[PDB]
Design a protein around this ligand. Structure first.
Ligand SMILES: *Cc1cc2c(cc1C)nc1c(=O)[nH]c(=O)nc-1n2C[C@H](O)[C@H](O)[C@H](O)COP(=O)(O)OP(=O)(O)OC[C@H]1O[C@@H](n2cnc3c(N)ncnc32)[C@H](O)[C@@H]1O
Ligand SMILES: *[C@@H]1O[C@H](CO)[C@@H](O[C@@H]2O[C@H](CO)[C@@H](O)[C@H](O)[C@H]2NC(C)=O)[C@H](O)[C@H]1NC(C)=O
Ligand SMILES: *[C@@H]1O[C@H](CO)[C@@H](O[C@@H]2O[C@H](CO)[C@@H](O)[C@H](O)[C@H]2NC(C)=O)[C@H](O)[C@H]1NC(C)=O
Ligand SMILES: *[C@@H]1O[C@H](CO)[C@@H](O[C@@H]2O[C@H](CO)[C@@H](O)[C@H](O)[C@H]2NC(C)=O)[C@H](O)[C@H]1NC(C)=O
Ligand SMILES: O=C(Nc1ccccc1)Nc1ccnc(Cl)c1
Ligand SMILES: *[C@@H]1O[C@H](CO)[C@@H](O)[C@H](O)[C@H]1NC(C)=O
Ligand SMILES: *[C@@H]1O[C@H](CO)[C@@H](O)[C@H](O)[C@H]1NC(C)=O
Length: 496
């Protein structure tokens, strides 16, 4: 039997089972795994979501797991619902009204539908002179999606991840109940959902903190051939004072084998800059080159430009990059934030976007980042053709709320390490997958207490270790309370 409201969804053509629908909801950015759902729901309102989850909750024997597809940027099927129902969240934003994104009248925050993509949140905010404070390097991800993980970028060292910049949310639990939550109201659900990997319910609305929108960003890159100086300077630029001047701090690792091409492909360096760095590498006989990437946001004030210069000069004076290897650019804030989009367009035209992405993402405690550098950047990765950026930068644990579901290392400072390998070569996938296993293996044997990010484990003991035994029990308590039938986001392979 079907509850009337559920059947109504089918009657309205919102519940599709046609191959076209199921197929589109069966692959993800990872392009490594796939799983066909039984059906796909195209909700036109949150009420439709209530109908589905309510049916599931009251219908004894309900056999359909439910996933919430934002844009499907998952790497290993976390957004799939094998033989179940995949919710096409984007459908909530089809109507031209009411708006799915509203900047508060006082301009202190911005309400956004869980299905909205950050790029649109940005535009709507800027139209009101404001903008979120914490981002992701790539803006075409949904609010609910990044919030179910963490949401990190170069601003996280000072503002914390995106999950630390949410005032409240509207969530529909596995029981089918629409609940508003925050630190004050239904705090247990609030904490569970942030970094919750879609296990407790679907986020239909997130109240995001904002700040007055800067107009421009002085964008700089500093080059190093010495990892010690490189990491010491990143830690200096992101150290708690309150934080330094820098609005954003990330880093890059370039292996010597493809140095010229990788530098040229940053879209930041000129061919003249490239020649100099290539020469530097040969002079130091380096197998790896490192580059800090930072920015200083400022506005259109008449004195801004000159004020930024002095500020920048002061900071640079405290660092240790190779003499003369500071490279500057100045762009509009929105241009900087949406910088990766151009790379997507280019890669797609080359047919190098819709390829397997065996990405390795993790948080590495600062005390062992040097060992990681030796074992991976100067070791395992040497002698291979690398396609994709190798991102490395520190984060401050103090800006992370350990009460939330997201898992992080115990040290006060830990690094976000993102090796974005693209399997462009023929069947070069199997090799990259083995390489990632080797890297993880190296870390386990060296005793490095890392945490994976954006990865889904397939063994219960792995998830228990991921969260930590005690934090795991809390995760389970929240599971039994909000999704007792264990139907939500089965692709995480936690309770499925
Ligand atoms: C493809 C990609 C991903 C990416 C990135 C760049 C690219 C090209 N850059 C990132 C960055 O700089 N920083 C960061 O923290 N993450 C970055 N990502 C990874 C991205 O965050 C993840 O892919 C994330 O999952 C968001 O992607 P998306 O919004 O497309 O979501 P999904 O993959 O479809 O679903 C992920 C899981 O979340 C659950 N989910 C989705 N929406 C909701 C809502 N509204 N409520 C509750 N749960 C939700 C899904 O069910 C799934 O399990
Ligand atoms: C954005 O603001 C609009 C109002 O300015 C909200 O619109 C209401 O939305 C609910 C359901 O979401 C409807 O039942 C009401 O009829 C709508 N009223 C209006 C003015 O049309 C909307 O909910 C807000 N969305 C966000 C981002 O929270
Ligand atoms: C960095 O990579 C370059 C290749 O881009 C290496 O240069 C090659 O070195 C071999 C033997 O030393 C020569 O036979 C090739 O002709 C060189 N290629 C070039 C650039 O023409 C270089 O040795 C590497 N440096 C380090 C420190 O590993
Ligand atoms: C330039 O750097 C290279 C690479 O770090 C040095 O070559 C390594 O030398 C050690 C010990 O001599 C060997 O164990 C490695 O196998 C070598 N690297 C590889 C794989 O080729 C080289 O000695 C340095 N140049 C000098 C002598 O200054
Ligand atoms: O993905 C990125 N960062 C990231 C990704 C996943 C987790 C954490 C950070 N950065 C990035 C930069 C340029 N091009 C692309 Cl495709 C991606
Ligand atoms: C990966 O992408 C290719 C090209 O679009 C597609 O043919 C293939 O079915 C995809 N595989 C997976 C596992 O999604
Ligand atoms: C900054 O100036 C540019 C061009 O003068 C303008 O487009 C932009 O709207 C300004 N930023 C603000 C405060 O909106």
């Amino acid at each position: 039997p079907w509850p009337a409201s559920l059947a109504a969804l089918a009657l309205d053509g919102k519940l599709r089972t046609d191959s076209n629908a199921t197929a589109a909801a069966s692959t993800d950015f990872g392009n490594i795994t796939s799983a066909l759902p039984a059906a796909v729901l195209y909700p036109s309102s949150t009420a439709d979501l209530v109908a589905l989850l309510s049916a599931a909750n009251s219908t004894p024997g309900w056999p359909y797991t439910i996933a919430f597809r934002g844009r499907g940027h998952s790497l290993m099927g976390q957004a799939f619902a094998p033989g179940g129902v995949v919710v096409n969240m984007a459908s909530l934003g089809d109507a031209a009204a009411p708006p799915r994104i509203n900047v508060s009248a006082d301009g202190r925050y911005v309400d956004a539908g869980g299905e909205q993509v950050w790029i649109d949140v940005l535009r709507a905010s800027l139209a009101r002179g404001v903008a979120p404070r914490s981002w992701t390097d790539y803006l075409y991800l949904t609010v609910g999606g990044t919030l179910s993980n963490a949401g990190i970028s170069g601003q996280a060292f000072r503002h914390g991840p995106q999950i630390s910049n949410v005032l409240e949310m509207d969530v529909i639990t596995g029981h089918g109940e629409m609940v508003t939550c925050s630190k004050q109201l239904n705090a247990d659900l609030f904490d569970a959902v942030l970094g919750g990997l879609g296990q407790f319910g679907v986020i239909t609305r997130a109240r995001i903190a904002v700040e007055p929108a800067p107009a421009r960003a002085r964008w700089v890159r500093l080059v190093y051939t010495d990892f010690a100086a490189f990491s010491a300077d990143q830690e200096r630029l992101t150290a708690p004072r309150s934080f330094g001047p820098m609005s954003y701090v990330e880093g890059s690792v370039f292996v010597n084998q493809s140095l010229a091409t990788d530098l040229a492909n940053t879209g930041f360096f000129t061919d003249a800059d490239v020649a100099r760095i290539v020469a530097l590498a040969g002079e130091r006989n380096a197998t790896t080159v490192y580059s800090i990437e930072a920015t200083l946001n400022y506005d259109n004030a008449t004195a801004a430009a000159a004020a930024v210069d002095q500020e920048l000069a002061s900071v640079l004076g405290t660092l240790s990059y190779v003499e003369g290897f500071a490279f500057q650019r100045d762009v509009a804030y929105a241009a900087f934030l949406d910088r990766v989009h151009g790379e997507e367009v280019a890669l797609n035209k080359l047919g190098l976007w819709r390829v397997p992405h065996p990405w390795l993402n993790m948080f590495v405690p600062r005390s062992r980042i040097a060992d990681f550098d030796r074992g991976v950047f100067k070791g395992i990765l040497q002698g291979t053709d690398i396609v994709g950026p190798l991102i490395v930068y520190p984060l401050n644990k103090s800006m992370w709320d350990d009460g939330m579901s997201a898992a992080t290392p115990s040290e006060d400072v830990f690094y976000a390490v993102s090796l974005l390998f693209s399997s462009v070569a023929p069947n070069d996938l199997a090799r990259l997958q083995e390489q990632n296993r080797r890297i993880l293996r190296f870390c386990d044997l060296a005793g490095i207490q890392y945490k994976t990010y954006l990865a889904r484990h397939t063994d219960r003991s792995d998830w228990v270790r991921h969260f930590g035994a005690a934090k795991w029990n809390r995760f389970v308590e929240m599971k039994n309370k909000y999704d007792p039938k264990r139907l939500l986001s089965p692709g995480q392979d936690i309770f499925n």
